[PDB]
mmCIF file of C-alpha atoms and ligand atoms in Angstrom:
data_model
loop_
_atom_site.group_PDB
_atom_site.id
_atom_site.type_symbol
_atom_site.label_atom_id
_atom_site.label_comp_id
_atom_site.label_asym_id
_atom_site.label_seq_id
_atom_site.Cartn_x
_atom_site.Cartn_y
_atom_site.Cartn_z
ATOM 1 C CA UNK Q 1 92.725 129.199 91.629
ATOM 2 C CA UNK Q 2 95.264 126.939 93.348
ATOM 3 C CA UNK Q 3 93.522 123.763 94.536
ATOM 4 C CA UNK Q 4 93.542 122.902 98.242
ATOM 5 C CA UNK Q 5 95.721 119.848 97.496
ATOM 6 C CA UNK Q 6 98.251 122.017 95.635
ATOM 7 C CA UNK Q 7 98.324 124.652 98.400
ATOM 8 C CA UNK Q 8 99.038 121.884 100.906
ATOM 9 C CA UNK Q 9 102.071 120.725 98.952
ATOM 10 C CA UNK Q 10 103.275 124.316 98.679
ATOM 11 C CA UNK Q 11 102.775 125.078 102.359
ATOM 12 C CA UNK Q 12 103.731 121.789 104.003
ATOM 13 C CA UNK Q 13 105.679 119.422 101.716
ATOM 14 C CA UNK Q 14 109.460 119.487 101.460
ATOM 15 C CA UNK Q 15 110.611 116.022 100.417
ATOM 16 C CA UNK Q 16 114.008 117.558 99.466
ATOM 17 C CA UNK Q 17 115.855 116.912 102.724
ATOM 18 C CA UNK Q 18 115.254 114.394 105.530
ATOM 19 C CA UNK Q 19 115.430 117.132 108.207
ATOM 20 C CA UNK Q 20 116.199 120.793 108.902
ATOM 21 C CA UNK Q 21 119.933 121.474 108.967
ATOM 22 C CA UNK Q 22 120.467 125.219 109.089
ATOM 23 C CA UNK Q 23 118.813 127.628 111.511
ATOM 24 C CA UNK Q 24 117.725 129.737 108.521
ATOM 25 C CA UNK Q 25 115.732 126.914 106.915
ATOM 26 C CA UNK Q 26 112.458 128.427 108.071
ATOM 27 C CA UNK Q 27 113.457 131.981 107.102
ATOM 28 C CA UNK Q 28 114.306 130.698 103.634
ATOM 29 C CA UNK Q 29 111.441 128.228 103.211
ATOM 30 C CA UNK Q 30 108.728 130.611 104.418
ATOM 31 C CA UNK Q 31 109.913 133.164 101.843
ATOM 32 C CA UNK Q 32 110.167 130.759 98.898
ATOM 33 C CA UNK Q 33 106.775 129.118 99.469
ATOM 34 C CA UNK Q 34 105.147 132.578 99.300
ATOM 35 C CA UNK Q 35 104.226 132.530 103.000
ATOM 36 C CA UNK Q 36 105.716 135.956 103.837
ATOM 37 C CA UNK Q 37 104.187 137.820 100.898
ATOM 38 C CA UNK Q 38 101.628 140.193 102.431
ATOM 39 C CA UNK Q 39 102.141 139.223 106.096
ATOM 40 C CA UNK Q 40 104.411 136.935 108.097
ATOM 41 C CA UNK Q 41 102.604 133.624 108.414
ATOM 42 C CA UNK Q 42 103.191 133.055 112.173
ATOM 43 C CA UNK Q 43 103.294 129.271 112.330
ATOM 44 C CA UNK Q 44 103.826 126.563 109.723
ATOM 45 C CA UNK Q 45 105.030 122.955 109.559
ATOM 46 C CA UNK Q 46 106.991 121.283 106.735
ATOM 47 C CA UNK Q 47 106.952 117.512 106.256
ATOM 48 C CA UNK Q 48 110.175 115.782 105.110
ATOM 49 C CA UNK Q 49 108.701 112.554 103.866
ATOM 50 C CA UNK Q 50 107.824 111.483 100.343
ATOM 51 C CA UNK Q 51 104.568 112.725 98.874
ATOM 52 C CA UNK Q 52 103.377 109.092 98.636
ATOM 53 C CA UNK Q 53 104.003 108.521 102.354
ATOM 54 C CA UNK Q 54 102.110 111.711 103.248
ATOM 55 C CA UNK Q 55 99.166 110.950 100.879
ATOM 56 C CA UNK Q 56 98.984 107.479 102.476
ATOM 57 C CA UNK Q 57 98.012 109.134 105.786
ATOM 58 C CA UNK Q 58 94.555 109.579 104.223
ATOM 59 C CA UNK Q 59 94.079 105.818 104.720
ATOM 60 C CA UNK Q 60 95.450 105.665 108.267
ATOM 61 C CA UNK Q 61 93.926 106.630 111.625
ATOM 62 C CA UNK Q 62 90.667 108.551 111.246
ATOM 63 C CA UNK Q 63 90.226 111.318 113.867
ATOM 64 C CA UNK Q 64 88.231 114.546 114.302
ATOM 65 C CA UNK Q 65 89.635 117.777 112.921
ATOM 66 C CA UNK Q 66 90.040 120.825 115.116
ATOM 67 C CA UNK Q 67 87.100 122.392 113.274
ATOM 68 C CA UNK Q 68 84.981 119.356 114.106
ATOM 69 C CA UNK Q 69 84.889 117.721 110.668
ATOM 70 C CA UNK Q 70 85.669 113.996 110.728
ATOM 71 C CA UNK Q 71 87.797 113.805 107.561
ATOM 72 C CA UNK Q 72 91.104 114.101 109.496
ATOM 73 C CA UNK Q 73 93.748 111.388 109.700
ATOM 74 C CA UNK Q 74 96.659 110.734 112.004
ATOM 75 C CA UNK Q 75 99.807 109.109 110.633
ATOM 76 C CA UNK Q 76 100.507 105.678 112.129
ATOM 77 C CA UNK Q 77 104.265 106.423 112.055
ATOM 78 C CA UNK Q 78 106.183 109.440 113.243
ATOM 79 C CA UNK Q 79 107.486 111.594 110.429
ATOM 80 C CA UNK Q 80 110.430 114.002 110.065
ATOM 81 C CA UNK Q 81 108.971 117.531 110.356
ATOM 82 C CA UNK Q 82 110.136 121.119 110.842
ATOM 83 C CA UNK Q 83 108.051 123.547 112.908
ATOM 84 C CA UNK Q 84 108.552 127.174 111.848
ATOM 85 C CA UNK Q 85 107.346 129.754 114.358
ATOM 86 C CA UNK Q 86 107.790 133.512 114.072
ATOM 87 C CA UNK Q 87 110.101 135.095 116.678
ATOM 88 C CA UNK Q 88 108.734 137.519 119.254
ATOM 89 C CA UNK Q 89 110.718 140.239 117.518
ATOM 90 C CA UNK Q 90 109.800 139.407 113.906
ATOM 91 C CA UNK Q 91 108.175 142.220 111.926
ATOM 92 C CA UNK Q 92 107.042 142.294 108.305
ATOM 93 C CA UNK Q 93 108.621 142.671 105.889
ATOM 94 C CA UNK Q 94 111.653 141.180 107.650
ATOM 95 C CA UNK Q 95 109.857 138.018 108.722
ATOM 96 C CA UNK Q 96 111.972 135.997 111.189
ATOM 97 C CA UNK Q 97 111.358 132.364 112.240
ATOM 98 C CA UNK Q 98 112.768 129.830 114.617
ATOM 99 C CA UNK Q 99 113.394 126.443 113.016
ATOM 100 C CA UNK Q 100 112.634 123.353 115.134
ATOM 101 C CA UNK Q 101 113.261 119.813 113.851
ATOM 102 C CA UNK Q 102 111.089 117.019 115.270
ATOM 103 C CA UNK Q 103 109.833 113.502 114.620
ATOM 104 C CA UNK Q 104 106.081 113.381 115.349
ATOM 105 C CA UNK Q 105 102.795 112.009 114.002
ATOM 106 C CA UNK Q 106 100.986 114.369 111.652
ATOM 107 C CA UNK Q 107 97.257 114.979 111.387
ATOM 108 C CA UNK Q 108 95.881 116.111 108.037
ATOM 109 C CA UNK Q 109 92.445 116.672 106.547
ATOM 110 C CA UNK Q 110 91.787 114.809 103.309
ATOM 111 C CA UNK Q 111 89.389 115.529 100.470
ATOM 112 C CA UNK Q 112 88.788 115.009 96.774
ATOM 113 C CA UNK Q 113 89.668 112.454 94.135
ATOM 114 C CA UNK Q 114 92.329 111.410 94.475
ATOM 115 C CA UNK Q 115 91.864 111.609 98.227
ATOM 116 C CA UNK Q 116 94.832 113.577 99.430
ATOM 117 C CA UNK Q 117 95.738 116.077 102.214
ATOM 118 C CA UNK Q 118 94.220 119.536 101.857
ATOM 119 C CA UNK Q 119 94.968 120.892 105.356
ATOM 120 C CA UNK Q 120 97.592 120.407 108.029
ATOM 121 C CA UNK Q 121 95.733 120.099 111.333
ATOM 122 C CA UNK Q 122 98.484 119.324 113.837
ATOM 123 C CA UNK Q 123 101.523 117.318 114.801
ATOM 124 C CA UNK Q 124 101.423 115.148 117.904
HETATM 125 N N1 WFU G 1 89.545 120.714 108.481
HETATM 126 C C1 WFU G 1 89.786 121.655 107.563
HETATM 127 N N2 WFU G 1 89.719 121.294 106.267
HETATM 128 C C2 WFU G 1 89.992 122.334 105.290
HETATM 129 N N3 WFU G 1 90.399 123.656 105.754
HETATM 130 C C3 WFU G 1 90.461 123.883 107.063
HETATM 131 C C4 WFU G 1 90.174 122.889 107.946
HETATM 132 N N4 WFU G 1 90.331 123.404 109.173
HETATM 133 C C5 WFU G 1 90.681 124.692 109.065
HETATM 134 N N5 WFU G 1 90.763 124.996 107.753
HETATM 135 C C6 WFU G 1 91.149 126.353 107.238
HETATM 136 O O1 WFU G 1 91.819 126.267 105.960
HETATM 137 C C7 WFU G 1 93.228 126.516 106.180
HETATM 138 C C8 WFU G 1 94.004 125.436 105.386
HETATM 139 O O2 WFU G 1 94.768 124.624 106.260
HETATM 140 P P1 WFU G 1 96.342 124.962 106.370
HETATM 141 O O3 WFU G 1 97.164 123.715 106.113
HETATM 142 O O4 WFU G 1 96.613 125.938 105.272
HETATM 143 N N6 WFU G 1 96.455 125.744 107.778
HETATM 144 C C9 WFU G 1 97.155 125.300 108.985
HETATM 145 C C10 WFU G 1 98.346 126.220 109.275
HETATM 146 C C11 WFU G 1 99.578 125.511 108.793
HETATM 147 C C12 WFU G 1 100.274 124.813 109.956
HETATM 148 O O5 WFU G 1 99.666 124.775 111.037
HETATM 149 O O6 WFU G 1 101.391 124.315 109.732
HETATM 150 C C13 WFU G 1 96.199 125.434 110.174
HETATM 151 O O7 WFU G 1 95.555 126.507 110.261
HETATM 152 O O8 WFU G 1 96.142 124.476 110.977
HETATM 153 C C14 WFU G 1 93.404 126.532 107.707
HETATM 154 O O9 WFU G 1 94.439 127.441 108.102
HETATM 155 C C15 WFU G 1 92.090 127.040 108.197
HETATM 156 O O10 WFU G 1 92.032 128.441 108.034
#
């Protein structure tokens, strides 16, 4: 099946643009990345940095993960991100999201060889 590293790129990487322009970004992105298939995925973040810059986080600030593992890393720099969060009114199969652009540090869990993000833990 899809590796954890590949799923991360699918769910969280969008190096295309440097930021969210349109208010339908999330609606569009959540559909295309297969995140509205069976249910509406309620919350998701996309990172608008290069894959190299994101993978480099795995050699930055080591921190605990939410689940208590210690293979999580905080980015030294703030990154361009978009937070997608389902509206109060959203109902499958017409999944509806609010798009919010931010610049924040990301925290990711890293694993494997090469040692790359496999989970998006938080932005801060
Ligand atoms: N440290 C951990 N290492 C590996 N898996 C973990 C860890 N911790 C939990 N999992 C479980 O494996 C999934 C893979 O991480 P996602 O990037 O897909 N999921 C984000 C939602 C996306 C967002 O927030 O933008 C999240 O739930 O934070 C987690 O949802 C959790 O069920």
